[model samples]
Target: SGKSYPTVSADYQKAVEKAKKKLRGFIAEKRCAPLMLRLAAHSAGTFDKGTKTGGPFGTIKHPAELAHSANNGLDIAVRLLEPLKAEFPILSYADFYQLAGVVAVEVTGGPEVPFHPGREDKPEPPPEGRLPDATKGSDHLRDVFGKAMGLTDQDIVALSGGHTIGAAHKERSGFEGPWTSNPLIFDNSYFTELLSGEKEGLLQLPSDKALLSDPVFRPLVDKYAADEDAFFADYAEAHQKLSELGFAD
Candidate 1:
């Protein structure tokens, strides 16, 4: 079994609050909510459930993983949060990255994704190629999220909703544009736009379009498109689960 424990340290708690305050300013003013969330997601999404390796133990900062093509342009997201680590040295990068993602979502009007702060940073990153590629479709999503990370179909769709906030850059992802007009606001508009069809300036990767065509994924897309609150609720839970992967003893 796996375990992710929360610290009871008063100092750590204060550091988290202070870090959150400063992060709110950076994320809001710079409008990098999407990058920060992606940073955290990439940090944890490398988990291989069967191998028990590559969880959110904060190796995402390692040069090896940072250089992974999947993590292109994410160094900017990391550089954005580096000052917070210096200020709150008590919080592990594992915890800091995850906490930053949670704060990014909340500051952007997304639901509160519960966070715990006991993860210890590892020196080495997992090998590259574990993170999902945006160009792939449903089968790839299942292989990465389902087989690799042990995530469910519902988790896959809800987590896809995260696209609601970010744009893909041609320079970084080889794709361009935002998923929604209000890309900075975290909401169900990703699903709404997907169901409503192509819109100028909004980007949907082949992977994004797969949701509407896949039998298991299509209904969840409709459910979230119709209910923002439901999306938020499930997204929060799924995000928490993603962050906790591969912590077994």
Candidate 2:
């Protein structure tokens, strides 16, 4: 799943890059990539291993779901990519949306997450209760992400590094400001910030600091804090898992 996205052709890659070129340069350099990632993350964050119900079906396009309080401003993220649908008729919303996320990360100086296809748009919005509650703490993180997604503590800590690229929106998450000074670039600063107590100095959500309080995950956090290469490597693998969740067999 590295760079070889089987269904993604050279032309398709060209088309995607063209779209990303526009997206990365114009409107949203910082917020856009992060929001796209959230859309990609949360889209699949809605899935259930048991019910097989929610995932990145791109069904959030439904006005009802997109307009929901939980999804409030995320529609903007979709709208940014929606422009390319007319350009690439071969791309489904499901693929394009997640692919947009991959582009967002890459353009923003993060690792290139391997792309995949076979995501078909859903007929209806998924039933609610899937996305994580940002207001909650560690046990909630472990239950939803760890036990549910089969992720290790290292995965959760590494994945949280996504916060490095984007800032919090006051209206969106009831939080404000970036986790690191250079929010446009993705890196291990989030871990370093957490370890040096810089992240706590910022407007961290309860969910963010929860990693340190949890005994099991804290050590992993320390490890990532000490090593940026390890953080990016683990983060790439974790992001790939998240993008492939509900589809991987």
Candidate 3:
């Protein structure tokens, strides 16, 4: 079994604690935390674009898998976390990536996302096209994340809460700026910012702006913007759904 024995060795527990502590440090490095959060998004973004083949179940060793467009510039994340892996060899890349996300949210003062260990490292790479397109609208976002991860319209909207913190760099996603003023904190402030209509010169990516401009999506966006609780409730549920994909537990 690949299970880490907590009782038989204190090493595994120490490893977990160490990783957690290191994660807190990383989160405190504000600029890095958003990118780190993007790393988790990219990691999960790799889910078999169609067949759900390449999820958070394999080490990010395959060039073919890592080279996908959705994973754009995420190699930086892998490189950043390399030392952590060296220190904790037992920690799988998949585990490290996901746990980084967990820590990112926690350090930002978001809800506790339960962490479970058991995702095995697979020899094969997942098929491509599972990630949501930064250039696409709500419909495309819905189709991509929904078909890929079995989510709903509401789920897609909720997950966009991630945009609350990270900026969409033109160098990275052809988009720019943090969605909210309080990017580091995890709260419904995103919704409040949206409804406040106070742009504060923070530009939205064309795709995101389109979601607000489009007749079909605008209402939904407005609803979320108006009701912070609604956004939070849905975001919390959608995030859980994202983490639960393909896990037996």
Candidate 4:
């Protein structure tokens, strides 16, 4: 006879909610939630089309993914959250990763993102070449994000909203400084910063600067920069789409 497993209990849900609330304190205290969101995005950024390997399942914390060229400086995110993981042992790495994005949005005064429970852990790591190279330009951005995540040009534009709240560290993405003064608050500041023509010594990564250099992205950037409502709509939708990836309802 086969061994029987226990029925699904409310334990996971209760634990998640409790962990989420505790995590919220960190978000409020440090304004680090946005950077946490960036970390999630960086992990999700590892999706690869050619082999269908990589995604949130890969546990970017692993040495291979962490050492990947595109994952530079993400160890900061892991280190920051390590203590939280210790406190919430019930939370899966997959769940913690997704929760970072969800909590970041809410804590930053953004709309509440819809999330579901139940992401299983993976025993092994994913194949390489899933992440995007910062040295690459628009085509690379399109190829990496577009094919891997099935994103459109508009979705790419919108998802870049992650830039709204966090500063790029020179040591991190080879980019320096925040796009806006707040850097911690989530808003359309990224759009505004891109289009405003008001430069105040903010640093731009080669990858970010590519927005201005490319003809296709320039107009979209300008539009989002000029119209807050448009940026908000697109950003919210794209963010939702990103969150929903690789998970079943």
Q: Global CA lDDT of candidate 3, please?
A: 0.67
Q: Write the per-residue lDDT of candidate 2 for residues 149-246, one digit (tens) a residue.
A: 65667778888888987877889867788888788788778777777775444656678888888887788888888877787788888887777666
Model 4 agreement with the true structure over 33-137: per-residue lDDT tens digits: 867887777666665546655566537888767887667777878888889878877777877887888889779877676666566666666666766666678
For lDDT, the strongest prediction is 1
Error of 4 at 199 (Å): 1.0
lDDT of 4 at 201: 68
Superposed model 3: Cα runs more than 4 Å off: 1-14, 48-50, 59-61, 196-200, 210-230
Q: Model 4 off-target regions past 4 Å? A: 1-9, 213-219
Q: What is the overall TM-score of model 2 with all chains considered together?
A: 0.87
Candidate 4 — which pairs collide? 165-183
> How much is 163 displaced in model 4, in angstroms?
0.6
User: Each candidate: what lDDT?
Assistant: 0.89, 0.74, 0.67, 0.73
How far in Å is the alpha carbon of 213 misplaced in model 3?
Answer: 6.7
Greater-TM-score candidate between 2 and 3: 2
Between the candidate structures 1 and 2, which one is better when assessed by lDDT?
1
Local accuracy of candidate 3 as per-residue lDDT tens digits, 1-249: 122412324665567678878878866774566777777766665554455565666545467766877666777777787777688887766667777877877787766666665466778767667677666676777666766766667766667777777666767666667887777777766656655664865656545655665565666677787776677677767665565466442
- Which ranking of candidates, highest TM-score first? 1, 2, 4, 3
Error of 2 at 200 (Å): 8.4
Please provide, for model 1 over 1-249, each residue's C-alpha lDDT reduced to its tens digit, 9 standing for 90 to 100: 256475458988888888888888878888888999999999999999888789799999987799999999989988878876898878889988988899889999999988776788888788889988878899999999999999899999999999999898989989999999999899999999999899887898999999999999999999999999899999998998887886533
